[PDB]
Amino acid sequence: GSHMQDPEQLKHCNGILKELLSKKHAAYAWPFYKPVDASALGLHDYHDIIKHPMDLSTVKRKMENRDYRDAQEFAADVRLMFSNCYKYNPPDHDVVAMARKLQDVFEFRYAKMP
Amino acid sequence: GSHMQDPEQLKHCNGILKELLSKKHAAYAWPFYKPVDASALGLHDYHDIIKHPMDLSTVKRKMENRDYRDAQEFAADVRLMFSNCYKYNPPDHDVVAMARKLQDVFEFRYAKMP
Ligand SMILES: Cn1c(=O)c2[nH]cnc2n(C)c1=O
Ligand SMILES: Cn1c(=O)c2[nH]cnc2n(C)c1=O
Ligand SMILES: Cn1c(=O)c2[nH]cnc2n(C)c1=O
Ligand SMILES: Cn1c(=O)c2[nH]cnc2n(C)c1=O
Numbered sequence: 165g166s167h168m169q170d171p172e173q174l175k176h177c178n179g180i181l182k183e184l185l186s187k188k189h190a191a192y193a194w195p196f197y198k199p200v201d202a203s204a205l206g207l208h209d210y211h212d213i214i215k216h217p218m219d220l221s222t223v224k225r226k227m228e229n230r231d232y233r234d235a236q237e238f239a240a241d242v243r244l245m246f247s248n249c250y251k252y253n254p255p256d257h258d259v260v261a262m263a264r265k266l267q268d269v270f271e272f273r274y275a276k277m278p
Numbered sequence: 279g280s281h282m283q284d285p286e287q288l289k290h291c292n293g294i295l296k297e298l299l300s301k302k303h304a305a306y307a308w309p310f311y312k313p314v315d316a317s318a319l320g321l322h323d324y325h326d327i328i329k330h331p332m333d334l335s336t337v338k339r340k341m342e343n344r345d346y347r348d349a350q351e352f353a354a355d356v357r358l359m360f361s362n363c364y365k366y367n368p369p370d371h372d373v374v375a376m377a378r379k380l381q382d383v384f385e386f387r388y389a390k391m392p
Contacts, residue, residue: 240350243357250389264382271381275364 166233173235173277178227180273181238184220189269192262196220196245213252218245235277242270280347287349287391292341294387295352298334303383306376310334310359327366332359349391356384 184193199219202210211217223241225231232238249263298307313333316324325331337355339345346352363377 236354239357240354243353247385247389250386251391255386267385268378271361272364272369275361277365 170234174227174232174238176277177232177235177238177274180270181220181223181227183273184242184266184270185224189266192265193220195249195259195262196266207252210252214248216244216248218242218248220245235274239274242274243267246270284348288341288346288352290391291346291349291352291388294384295334295337295341297387298356298380298384299338303380306379307334309363309373309376310380321366324366328362330358330362332356332362334359349388353388356388357381360384 183189185197196219198221199217200207200210200214202208218241223238223245226241227238232241246263246267249260253260297303299311310333312335313331314321314324314328316322332355337352337359340355341352346355360377360381363374367374
């Protein structure tokens with residue numbers, strides 16, 4: 165059920181999303197900008213292992229289209245994106261190191277929800 | 279709607295929970311074992327800042343009582359527990375360092391969901 169706080173909480177989510185896409189974090193956010201192109205990257209098992217792909221451009225489209233009804237729905241998609249990275253790649257992969265840094269940005273600001 | 283995979287996914291969640299409570303992680307998991315006793319700790323603003331407290335003993339009770347209907351519901355509570363820590367405490371607090379380590383244990387194993 166919609167709560168009167170949902171629009172303002174979704175604005176905070178949109179602010180987080182803008183930050184995740186901003187130049188400040190680009191050195192470690194770039195793998196998450198667009199859907200994994202598994203074939204182009206030679207990751208021919210990606211879609212067998214990752215049944216629910218997610219990336220920031222998809223989160224952005226869903227925000228713009230008002231798909232997310234509350235902050236929790238938005239956060240679940242962002243976390244799914246990171247979990248897919250942790251599931252698919254070995255834990256010492258540089259993309260995992262980047263995911264952990266970007267997820268720290270996300271989690272600490274999401275925790276500051278007004 | 280319940281899916282036939284939900285019992286086995288909740289068993290994986292229960293395994294994660296058991297690991298989070300195990301001696302292997304006790305050096306950094308202990309702050310999360312029981313509800314924050316705000317008055318006893320002198321944290322007299324805790325319940326003004328944290329509107330939804332969560333801790334591992336509460337997650338355990340909810341698992342034992344079949345409160346969680348799927349893995350996503352379980353994960354949201356575990357993540358709420360960590361987010362409360364990130365919200366309430368300064369980011370250099372030792373309890374935050376412990377939360378980040380325990381959350382890494384959680385996220386990497388949750389990502390290995392069968
Ligand atoms: C360093 N780096 C890369 O190595 C890379 N590869 C693809 N986009 C990239 N971007 C945006 C980037 O900043
Ligand atoms: C998200 N992601 C991955 O998980 C990954 N694994 C290997 N290359 C990868 N690339 C380029 C990527 O963007
Ligand atoms: C080190 N340490 C502590 O400092 C502590 N304080 C309360 N429980 C505690 N436990 C279980 C612990 O291991
Ligand atoms: C979870 N948590 C906290 O967030 C915290 N902040 C200060 N002491 C704290 N303690 C003992 C604690 O258990």
